[PDB]
Design an enzyme around this catalytic site. Structure first.
Site, PDB file in Angstrom:
ATOM      1  N   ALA A  98       0.841  -1.188   0.000  1.00 56.91           N
ATOM      2  CA  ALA A  98       0.000   0.000   0.000  1.00 56.91           C
ATOM      3  C   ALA A  98       0.878   1.240   0.000  1.00 56.91           C
ATOM      4  O   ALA A  98       0.745   2.055  -0.902  1.00 56.91           O
ATOM      5  CB  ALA A  98      -0.934   0.007   1.192  1.00 56.91           C
ATOM      6  N   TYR A  99       1.823   1.352   0.942  1.00 54.59           N
ATOM      7  CA  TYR A  99       2.681   2.516   0.966  1.00 54.59           C
ATOM      8  C   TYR A  99       3.424   2.763  -0.365  1.00 54.59           C
ATOM      9  O   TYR A  99       3.603   3.905  -0.789  1.00 54.59           O
ATOM     10  CB  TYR A  99       3.690   2.450   2.101  1.00 54.59           C
ATOM     11  CG  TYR A  99       4.631   3.677   2.081  1.00 54.59           C
ATOM     12  CD1 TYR A  99       4.155   4.974   2.357  1.00 54.59           C
ATOM     13  CD2 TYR A  99       5.998   3.534   1.810  1.00 54.59           C
ATOM     14  CE1 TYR A  99       5.025   6.076   2.364  1.00 54.59           C
ATOM     15  CE2 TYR A  99       6.869   4.635   1.823  1.00 54.59           C
ATOM     16  CZ  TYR A  99       6.365   5.887   2.099  1.00 54.59           C
ATOM     17  OH  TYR A  99       7.221   6.938   2.084  1.00 54.59           O
ATOM     18  N   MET A 100       3.870   1.716  -1.036  1.00 56.34           N
ATOM     19  CA  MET A 100       4.565   1.890  -2.309  1.00 56.34           C
ATOM     20  C   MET A 100       3.669   2.176  -3.523  1.00 56.34           C
ATOM     21  O   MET A 100       4.038   2.930  -4.420  1.00 56.34           O
ATOM     22  CB  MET A 100       5.453   0.684  -2.532  1.00 56.34           C
ATOM     23  CG  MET A 100       6.699   0.737  -1.664  1.00 56.34           C
ATOM     24  SD  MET A 100       7.900   1.857  -2.497  1.00 56.34           S
ATOM     25  CE  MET A 100       8.130   3.240  -1.309  1.00 56.34           C
TER      26      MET A 100
END
EC number: 5.6.2.1
Length: 221
Positions: free
Chosen positions: A184-186
């Site tokens: 998700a963060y990437m």
């Protein structure tokens, strides 16, 4: 995300610090426990867990095949975690690892003047715990594949398929699908840079270092 931006950016810089340390200590003879840090530090950060950490310090000089253009390292950590990577003559590791190798002592450990306490403390004194280095690696692997994709694939897949392809490749590379928090963060990070009309077009002409920097510049902002 505030937190993950901070860490990613912290490691990108801390890495710069560990690399200077390396270029200091590798000049330090052989037997130096610090020269031995710099060699292990080089081996660690050059990720291209705890279980295999054991096996590496449990690395016997007799499993390190040495030849003119390569060095093949072999270890077994808790049965399953058995590996046999190679280091090529040109790669930063070859020479310091050639100098570290003692062939007069087959049964003694390569990293004899080090261990759990020695390595772990070094890295942590840099401002980042182990975890910080591990997630960073997966972020680095994701960015590398993403980067690799944009310059090799023509025409381009588009943000969602490009991202999905990069996650699949990183799962194939790292061996497992990274956490949802990580993915998700990437993906988000990438979808937000893609809002720039020239982002992908520029990335297709960057070197990986120009790219990684463009990504740190963004996360930092």
């Amino acid at each position: 995300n505030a937190k993950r931006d901070r860490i990613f950016v912290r490691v990108y810089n801390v890495m710069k610090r560990i690399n200077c340390f390396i270029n200091k200590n590798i000049k330090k003879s052989s037997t130096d426990s610090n020269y031995q840090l710099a060699v292990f530090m080089l081996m660690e950060t050059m990720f291209f867990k705890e279980n295999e950490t054991v096996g590496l310090l449990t690395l016997k000089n007799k499993h390190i095949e040495i030849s003119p253009d390569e060095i093949v390292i072999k270890f077994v950590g808790k049965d399953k975690v058995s590996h046999e990577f190679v280091v090529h003559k040109s790669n930063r590791l070859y020479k310091p690892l050639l100098k570290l190798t003692d062939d007069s002592s087959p049964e003694e450990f390569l990293f004899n003047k080090l261990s759990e306490r020695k390595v772990y403390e070094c890295i942590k004194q840099f401002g980042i715990r182990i975890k910080d280095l591990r997630t960073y690696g997966v972020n680095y692997t994701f960015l590398y594949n993403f980067w690799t994709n944009v310059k090799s694939i023509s025409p381009l897949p588009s943000p969602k398929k490009l991202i999905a392809l990069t996650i699949k490749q990183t799962a194939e590379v790292v061996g497992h699908t990274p956490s949802i928090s990580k993915r998700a963060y990437m993906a988000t990070t990438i979808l937000e840079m893609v809002k720039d009309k020239n982002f992908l077009d520029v990335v297709s002409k960057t070197t990986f270092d120009e790219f990684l920097s463009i990504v740190v510049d963004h996360v930092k902002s």
